[PDB]
Design a binder for this molecule. Sequence first.
Ligand code: A1AP7
Ligand code: A1AP7
Ligand code: A1AP7
Ligand code: CL
Ligand code: ZN
Ligand code: ZN
Length: 574
Amino acid sequence: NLDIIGKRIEKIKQEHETSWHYDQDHPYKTWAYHGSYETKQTASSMVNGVVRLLTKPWDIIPMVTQMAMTEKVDTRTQEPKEGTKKLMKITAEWLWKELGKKKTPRMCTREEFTRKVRSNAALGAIFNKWKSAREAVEDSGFWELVDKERNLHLEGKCETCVYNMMIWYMWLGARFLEFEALGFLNEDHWFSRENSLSGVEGEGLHKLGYILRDVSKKEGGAMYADDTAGWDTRITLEDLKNEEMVTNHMEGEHKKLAEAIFKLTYQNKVVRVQRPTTVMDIISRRDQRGSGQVVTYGLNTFTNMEAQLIRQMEGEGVFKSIQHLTVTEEIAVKNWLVRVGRERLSRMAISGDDCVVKPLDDRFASALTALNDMGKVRKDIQQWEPSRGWNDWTQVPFCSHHFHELIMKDGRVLVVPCRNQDELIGRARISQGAGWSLRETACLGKSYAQMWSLMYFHRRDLRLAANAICSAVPSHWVPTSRTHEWMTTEDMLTVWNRVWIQENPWMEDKTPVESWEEIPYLGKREDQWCGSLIGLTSRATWAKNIQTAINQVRSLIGNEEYTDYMPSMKRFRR
Ligand SMILES: Cc1cn[nH]c1-c1ccncc1
Ligand SMILES: Cc1cn[nH]c1-c1ccncc1
Ligand SMILES: Cc1cn[nH]c1-c1ccncc1
Ligand SMILES: [Cl-]
Ligand SMILES: [Zn+2]
Ligand SMILES: [Zn+2]
């Protein structure tokens, strides 16, 4: 409690001494409350006009148009039983060693951090003293503040590492110290599939289907894809202590700096929350996930890999009960990990809180005691109801997608990502933040269009809309995003060949594709099942009259150099 968090709390009181009070009508039951102080302030989703003018048939589809319009944090998780705590400690110890065999923990640098801010990563900072991250990083006074907190952390204390709720934004300084100590997990790809066997970090949406098809090839039971209800709110203090064991692999300054991030900011937290009754509440708690989103991704992947290996151990009968491991169950658990752990990791695809598991057999479906007792309660099923698995890898949900096997005219086999097309069009019609020029709006539309050409070329409506947007935006204008092989001014046919043929390890024949007409679509009925408007009168008029829509947008942007991409399609090619 207050010996670790007091200084942060003490400091905040004194900046708002004219406003402090122990408000007696505070809604917090599971968060420890400290005080309140006067403030006044809050950005909604804005429509991208370039994408909307080129997707007119979707203007009357509520699932698209509603996407642009518009008491889980205040719960507590019970402490796991002694048997569960032992399983988690043994598995976590083993997993950090496997992940560390071919990697070396190391500090990330001011230089590395500076380069990140200078090409727009979502580091979750705040606006004050400087306007933006770019300005703060370029100012020697910032680094002096960073230095003060840094020496405080080496001394085992904290003053300014406080979360702001809304996503848990910190000041750029606290973000740096997090990245210095734990950035290596992402920067050096600890959760790549090569390094972690279950992980998919850095793999790309064009590989995830092939990875699930490789898991499907293993002998075993159904494929399980159980979602957890509010994963970040079910991270226990036992979880945070197993995660901290990465520091056992560190040395020198780095070990001390990383131990301080875990001890002072993760296992103890201070948060400011807006309450319209508009005060700022200063609350603390020990458990749940509140890191930067990139460290959150890696530690979620780690704890998810651990949880799923334990659920596999439960299905395989490695231990009888979570109440208590006997001396010899401990040796059996250790021995399972050493002899088959790596094989059992290869049976999984894990992206943070999202997993797919192909267990040895279907005993897994009813192996629920460790999973429930670890607090990883499944979403949308009763606590003790057996999991429903998937019999076909092409039906399994993963990372908001499903995956199709698509046969090219020349016999070669693509495995492609897919999701309901209303979700894809709805997302592309939305921009975030203020002060967007027409050029910037056009360049964001072009980013969506090029992603569609690379990932969703097999959807008739998206290949046509992608071609239309690329025809409507000046040819040399560079795709942008405010938070990815489609981010380029290279010819997208050249990029398609590099991604799906040349660099694709599942494609043995490397014969390049000469034109977009060689690149196939889903079956027409499959395209409709996944939300295509092909067959509707609105869609036929849009396709036939597309040059008129392209010319509307070209007239708004003005007299620029444009290319016609529509004749890359059979139906427009004379
Ligand atoms: C330090 C620096 C400067 N220009 N590029 C790098 C760099 C890039 C990628 N990995 C490590 C270093
Ligand atoms: C977490 C997230 C969301 N969209 N994409 C990712 C991602 C990208 C690359 N490697 C791992 C994850
Ligand atoms: C799109 C998404 C969501 N969660 N994770 C991913 C992902 C993972 C790995 N590579 C690319 C993307
Ligand atoms: Cl199925
Ligand atoms: Zn601190
Ligand atoms: Zn589909």
